[PDB]
Amino acid sequence: SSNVSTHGMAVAPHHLASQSALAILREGGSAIEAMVAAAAAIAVVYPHMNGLGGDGFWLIVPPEGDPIAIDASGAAGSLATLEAYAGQRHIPNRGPQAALTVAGTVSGWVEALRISRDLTGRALPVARLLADAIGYAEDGIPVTASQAHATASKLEELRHQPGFSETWLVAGEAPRPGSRFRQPALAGTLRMLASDGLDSFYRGPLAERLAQGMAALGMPITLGDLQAHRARRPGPLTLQHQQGTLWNLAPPTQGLVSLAILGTDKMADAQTVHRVEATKRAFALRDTDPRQQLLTPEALQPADS
């Protein structure tokens, strides 16, 4: 059954992240600042699936206006040239050469927060938004089973990578589910973000500490790459249907097919999966390169099949 409330609501893959967002709300914070606190909490608690070392994506629906999208994904490094990957038939999956694009989420947090200061009239201290994330790093998390499983099932391949064993292993194996697991390094990083500010990740002391680390490692990324990087703000792909408007963050090449499926839209039981037939006729509608809002009932009614 469905949890129902009256003031605020956070849904997250881990209950500790849900509560980090929820506290910010109860403390007078906005849904965005509550989301940012969660992005940092879920980074400590599910480090194998996401974290400060990756990209982030926002779709924001204000009470009245149009939706706001944030593409917080980083670009390849300035050293990542077509030559540097020789006669290799692909870019490696692990190692310093696979860590070739910039990490965007933190730029998503910095941008969303500036949005949340425009929309709200207020804003909470950054040191408050990261508080839970910091303490779960120094003082530990309950090891999830999927963190233990992912670590075990990748142990032989990632065992030797720079920083892996020192950071993810315990006595050189995968940590036991239900055990207390610390990240003393990640806490100094999060404490730097709180003192210096989120943008220091790309333009402050932490950015320069990240630069040296990339150099020492042989990573195709420079300090210039970080400093030059902002979260993007594309327009959401918008679908009009009989019951209203629906948005997806995706470029027109990748998201046309998914949204067209829904535009389906006389359906009020096994027919339900079959009427999949819409998806067949939908990929067809895509067929240059990654080449727009045709997704109109004036355009999908030929469906009539």
Partner: protein, 149 residues
């Protein structure tokens, strides 16, 4: 890949995706930071400062006044079809819309996979109703949590 939703008391609704694309990204941790770095070599081919071409947070506004944020992690375009057609088109309650088995080919709860396959995904959602009541739903296929006051 994590999906998260938040709606606050004024009705501001946020739908968020955060990821390193593959488990533990590159394996590579950056010295004295604790940051494992993502590994997006697949967003490029072989015939610098170039951005990749990509993940899909979702949100909807409905004529009757509902706002809604949702998201699927793992699997994917058929998960969105299912949740849209079940919840929006067919009036199925939000939590049931996410639970009812899905298809890529089909979940045993109806070629035919286990009754709950990690390949149909993990989806979450919040619906805000014009009366201000807030509804969060979690996927039984994972260990998500809805927290509200």
């Amino acid at each position: 890949t994590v999906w998260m939703g938040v709606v606050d008391n004024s009705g501001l609704a946020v739908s968020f995706i955060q990821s390193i694309y593959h488990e533990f990204g590159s394996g590579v941790v950056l010295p004295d930071t604790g940051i494992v770095w993502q590994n997006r070599g697949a967003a490029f081919s072989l015939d610098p400062g170039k951005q990749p071409f990509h993940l899909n947070p979702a949100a909807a506004r409905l004529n009757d006044g509902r706002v809604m944020v949702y998201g699927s992690m793992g699997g994917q375009p058929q998960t969105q079809a299912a949740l849209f057609t079940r919840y929006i088109l067919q009036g199925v309650p939000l939590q049931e819309s996410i639970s009812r088995p899905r298809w890529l080919k089909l979940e045993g709860r109806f070629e035919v996979l286990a009754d709950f396959s990690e390949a149909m995904g993990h989806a979450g959602a919040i619906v805000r109703h014009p009366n201000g009541l807030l509804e969060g739903a979690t996927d039984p296929r994972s260990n998500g949590a809805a927290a509200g006051y």
